[PDB]
């Protein structure tokens, strides 16, 4: 499968825009996260090779990466809308509104800061598609299939950068800058998981089964 075929398969695998329809904010986010987690398992299964991995691996990668993969989704939706986090079309928050729940302004600042580095770097849709897949496959018989799956999405990202037709020097520099930003996405998801597990312990977040199972995994 060529890099272009793979990237086109990721374009196809893209989940649809999800709408949700003090406490209200946090009820909205957990409801969004739970709806998005359903779309994320369809998306994962349409990654060429993913369903060929052992079920243990499939589960372990989703369990590991789900919050990183939501936040990458959020940052892409938010990229054109500076100062704004486009959780959903009917859920658009700014840093101010984060102030209302303890620990959330910290998380909105990371997401918004990382969002602006991606914006300054002019992240392209086809770049986003590759890195999001890589977040999943790089979390953290079967294990060699995983490595092949991951090299192939990495080859695809190198391809997308090549097609911009910037210098080789600059393709390498771009590649590095995009991969370094991922650790800032993973940090923001580390903080979000900590916050969300804290709200669950105090049972202040609606019981949602797939979100719950996904959180318990941690």
């Amino acid at each position: 499968l060529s890099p272009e075929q793979l990237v086109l398969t990721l374009l196809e695998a893209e989940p649809p825009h999800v709408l949700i329809s003090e406490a209200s904010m946090m009820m909205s986010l957990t409801k969004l996260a739970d709806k998005e987690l359903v779309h994320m398992i369809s998306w994962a299964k349409k990654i060429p090779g993913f369903v060929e991995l052992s079920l243990f691996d499939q589960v372990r990668l989703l369990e590991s990466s789900w919050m990183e993969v939501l936040m990458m989704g959020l940052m892409w939706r938010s990229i054109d809308h500076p100062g704004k986090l486009i959780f959903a079309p009917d859920l658009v928050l700014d840093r101010d509104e984060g102030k209302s729940v303890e620990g959330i302004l910290e998380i909105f600042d990371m997401l918004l800061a990382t969002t602006s580095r991606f914006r300054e770097l002019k992240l392209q849709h086809k770049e986003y598609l590759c890195v999001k897949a890589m977040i999943l496959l790089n979390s953290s018989d079967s294990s060699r299939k995983l490595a092949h799956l991951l090299n192939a999405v990495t080859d695809a990202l190198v391809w997308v950068i090549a097609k911009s037709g910037i210098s080789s020097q600059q393709q390498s520099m771009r590649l590095a800058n995009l991969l370094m930003l991922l650790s800032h996405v993973r940090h923001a998801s580390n903080k979000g998981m900590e916050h969300l597990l804290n709200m669950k312990s105090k049972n202040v977040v609606p019981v949602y089964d797939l979100l719950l199972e996904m959180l318990n995994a941690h």
């Binding site: 359903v38 369809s42 994962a44 079920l55 589960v59 989703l62 089964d209 797939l210 719950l212 199972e213």
Partner: peptide
């Protein structure tokens, strides 16, 4: 509650 394995299998 095993909705992840369930969604992965169908």
């Amino acid at each position: 509650s095993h909705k992840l394995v369930q969604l992965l299998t169908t």
